[PDB]
Every structure is written in structure tokens, then in C-alpha cells.
Design a protein around this ligand. Structure first.
Ligand code: SIA
Ligand code: SIA
Ligand code: SIA
Lengths: 138, 138, 138
């Protein structure tokens, strides 16, 4: 078909926009808030999906940050690796290969973001990558 | 169509289950043994596909671990990055971004797992990621 | 449908071959110059897409290497992580998880390759991964 619009919404009401295509057993979904642009002929600007502490569940264990979501779609996605910047409370930051999924618990979608140990508590995780999940249904 | 079930089997007879969708030139395949769950409202549990030494070919060169497989499907997949835990024989372990493919040699499928140098011989590689390959046929 | 052939071409006229499948809103595209082979029953050979300095725009900022392309297709792809080897001018080299995209500026396709800091100027980036992008159109 053609690409349908949609979004999820976080605890703090941040809106995660996306375009999808549901085919037979197949759901493909791209998050569209941070598509990066060449601003001019020589510079590439990454954009971020900024997720703060208050969008994650507490406690956090095993550098696993869970983002309970609302609305949107209910998928058990594969895992995709992405570019993360992780901001510590002291404003230190660390660029990492993070690993994201969509999963469902109690019929609610959640984003699973896993990354590496950091020397502090995290203030914010920025996702600098354009994310697309190809999911299988049923 | 709807998602068909399938599996590969290793030298040591470990069974690698998967769901797929074959469309025209297109084969999409997700491994389903290690789909991770929120066990309760706050904890996310990763599962592993555990591959021991005896599932790989010898000799091993360039931190490339080849897993000759049986049955299943014959695809030259793209490369997907995943979360690996690599267990050394002294039970030390290292978390890495590993890179997997499906390829075919002498009409047999093989899994290609590449990762980083470690200070020892490897006892086991665990794949903590949900793997899905989108492959092109012909 | 069945997988169509195609290519892009760089500033220095290097040819980037690929196979694709355009469905309704969906373009899937695999680069085919570096599909890796088991050369014999025990050895896996990676191949590279070798990109030299003269294929990138200048100046380079934020370890972001832009490869302006010609012909081929015009897609705003998601970001895919890949295996990079980065060769310095002193022939030192660094293996990295790099992150690639296809994007369009002034109606021209460009490849966006991002990677980590290195202690020197880069002579060449080799992409050791088989790249496939699943893109959404419109
Ligand atoms: C990945 C996965 O299987 N998720 C499932 C979870 C967990 O499996 C439970 O913890 C097992 O009881 O269970 C559900 O029934 C749920 O609560 O929404 C369906 C959901 O898709
Ligand atoms: C990635 C790839 O091309 N794999 C192919 C290999 C190698 O190319 C050979 O080493 C070249 O002789 O060859 C086959 O004929 C084979 O033995 O199964 C088909 C297989 O798909
Ligand atoms: C990712 C993205 O949006 N790229 C678009 C760019 C930039 O957005 C411009 O810098 C905004 O003016 O604009 C176009 O009009 C262009 O020049 O080709 C279309 C292109 O797809």
C-alpha cells in the first residue's frame, strides 16, 4: 500500500511520529522525527529523538532503559542497532552503539533501549539514527 | 502471505527456530528462539541463542566463526549487527557488536559470525539480539 | 517483482552496483559489489567497498563522510550500521561500527557514512558488510 502516518506517546507526552506499511504478515515501521538533512551542499545534520529520564521506568537494570508507550502499534520487533548519545547528569556525554526493540507487555507497546555502562546516572538518551523496523506478525 | 515456521540445525544438533515470509524476490526471516520479554512491568529479560565451540568450524581465522547448518533455507543474506556475549574458556566474557550473515557453500547454509579480538579462546557465543534478515533472491 | 539491477557512480567514477525491488511505497536495495564468500569449506572472505578521500566532499566535519553519487535511485533511507575499516594516510587502520544512509540533496543521491574519531586524516574507508536498505517512499 502507501505509507500511513502514526505516532506513539511517552509518559511525559512527547510524541514519537512514524510512517508504516502493514502488508500480509509484515509490518514495516519507520520513525520520522529525526530524518537527517544535508542543510547545504557540504554539511550533514543529524537530528535526535531526545528521551529524558522521566520517559523511562524505574528502577533501571543492566543498562536497559524501558520507554512505556501509548497508542501507535503493538509489535514484537526485531532488535535494531542505532547511534546513541547518552547525556549524564553532570552533562558529560557518550556516543554508543545502542540496541532498540519494540515489545508488548500487558497489551502496551514499550521501547527497549540497551546500551553500554556509563560512569553516572543518565539524564537523556538521544537517538541520532533513522530507525526502521521490519516486523513479522503472527 | 502468513509467517511460515522453519528451523536450521547445527553440527551438535542444536535447533535454530525461525518464522519467514517468502514473497516474489524477497525472503524475510526472523529467528524466534530468543525473543525477549518483559517478565513483569519493570524488568526486560534478554534471551540468548547459545552457540558453543563445537558448532563452529576449525580452524577459526580473523575472529570469524562459521556455523555450518542443515535444512532451513538457502540465502545469501545481508549482514546484520547484533549483541554478542562471548564467553572465554576461563569464563571471562565480553559484550560486543557482532556481525551475522547467512551464506551458502557447496549448497549448504552457514551462519557467519564476526566479532572483535578477545584475550583467549572462545567457549561460547551468545546472541542476545532478535535477528531478522531481509534477503533478495535472484 | 524480481530483483532489478542498477548502480550509482562516485566523483572518481567508481561504480557502486546494486539489486533492488520497488513495491508500492517500499524500496529495498542491496549493494552487491562485496558479497562475501566461503572460498573453500573453512575460510570466509569479506570483500570491501573501497571508498577513497576523493569520493568524499570537503571539508569533513564530525567524522561524517559524504559521498555524492550519480544515477541510481533517490531515497531517504534509514540508517544502517556496518563494518568499516578506516585506513589512515600513514597506513594505520581502524575497524569500526560505521553508520550509513542514503539521502538526497538538490535532487542528488548521497551516501552518508559516519564513524568514530581517528588519530589522523583518512585515506580510505572500506565497507566490509553486505548492505541492504529497506526504504519507505512517500
Ligand atoms: C515477547 C512476548 O512474548 N511478550 C508477551 C508477554 C510476555 O510473554 C509475558 O510475560 C508472558 O506471560 O505476554 C503477553 O501475554 C502480554 O503480557 O502482553 C503478550 C506479549 O506479547
Ligand atoms: C556468496 C557466494 O557467491 N556463494 C556461492 C559459492 C562461492 O561463490 C564459490 O566459492 C565460488 O566458486 O559458490 C556456490 O557455487 C556454492 O559453492 O554453493 C554458490 C554459492 O552461493
Ligand atoms: C532529508 C530531506 O528532507 N532532504 C530534502 C532536502 C533538505 O530537506 C533541504 O535542506 C531543506 O530545504 O530538500 C530537498 O528539497 C532537496 O534539496 O533535495 C528534498 C530532500 O529530500
Amino acid at each position: 500500500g502507501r505509507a500511513t502516518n502514526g505516532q506513539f506517546v511517552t509518559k511525559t507526552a512527547k510524541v514519537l511520529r512514524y510512517k508504516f506499511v502493514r502488508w500480509d504478515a509484515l509490518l514495516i515501521i519507520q520513525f520520522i522525527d529525526n530524518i537527517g538533512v544535508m542543510e547545504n551542499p557540504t554539511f550533514y545534520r543529524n537530528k535526535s529523538i531526545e528521551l529524558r529520564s522521566a520517559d523511562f521506568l524505574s528502577p533501571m537494570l543492566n543498562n536497559t532503559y524501558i520507554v512505556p508507550l501509548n497508542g501507535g502499534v503493538r509489535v514484537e520487533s526485531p532488535t535494531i542497532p542505532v547511534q546513541l548519545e547518552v547525556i549524564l547528569e553532570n552533562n558529560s556525554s557518550f556516543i554508543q552503539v545502542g540496541f532498540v526493540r519494540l515489545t508488548v507487555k500487558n497489551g502496551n507497546p514499550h521501547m527497549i533501549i540497551q546500551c553500554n555502562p556509563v560512569p553516572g546516572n543518565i539524564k537523556m538518551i538521544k537517538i541520532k539514527s533513522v530507525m526502521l523496523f521490519t516486523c513479522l506478525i503472527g
